[PDB]
Design a binder for this molecule. Sequence first.
Ligand SMILES: [Cl-]
Ligand SMILES: [Cl-]
Length: 217
Amino acid sequence: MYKYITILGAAGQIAQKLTATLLTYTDMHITLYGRQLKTRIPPEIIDHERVTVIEGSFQNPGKLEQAVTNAEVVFVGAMESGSDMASIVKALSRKNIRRVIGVSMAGLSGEFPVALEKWTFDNLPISYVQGERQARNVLRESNLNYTILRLTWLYNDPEKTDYELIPEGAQFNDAQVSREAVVKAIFDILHAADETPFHRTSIGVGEPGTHYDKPSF
Ligand SMILES: [Cl-]
Ligand SMILES: [Cl-]
């Protein structure tokens, strides 16, 4: 049971959907951190008593530390940069924050089958992939109680909420997953009475039955 969550990268699509879900279905107090949030996130999200908005970048240690002070859990919406992750890990360290859920990309560990892997890496900038590797590495090298969610290709569909969790090392065959399904998985992890399965683990999140060579239309 967590009451106070800080969402880093709060303007991202999954982060905004998570925020709405937490406001609608929990009594959690939410702190949103990111650039220009009061302008980038809509009113139905930030105009709630249980929402606190703090504007700043990951290169703003003062504001970042403010945002995570007394957080019981921290959600990192984007693990795109080694430097940014190091700043995040340092801020958490200084504020004695232990629990972190972060979103990364599936495929970095060679877990996709051949066709899906080739399509994936021909459709992402190299710099994006490299930054994701570095961010992952920084978090894994920390002493945080982290859960990394390795997401396959994202799309939006309110009717598609099914997910499965793919353990580290297992072949990851799902070519897509909806952002709504990922949000349900995050919600479910936040509500896990026994956190053991998520303690310093890296878990794939995919839509069951999407064993394709590339994501669908
Ligand atoms: Cl953001
Ligand atoms: Cl997203």
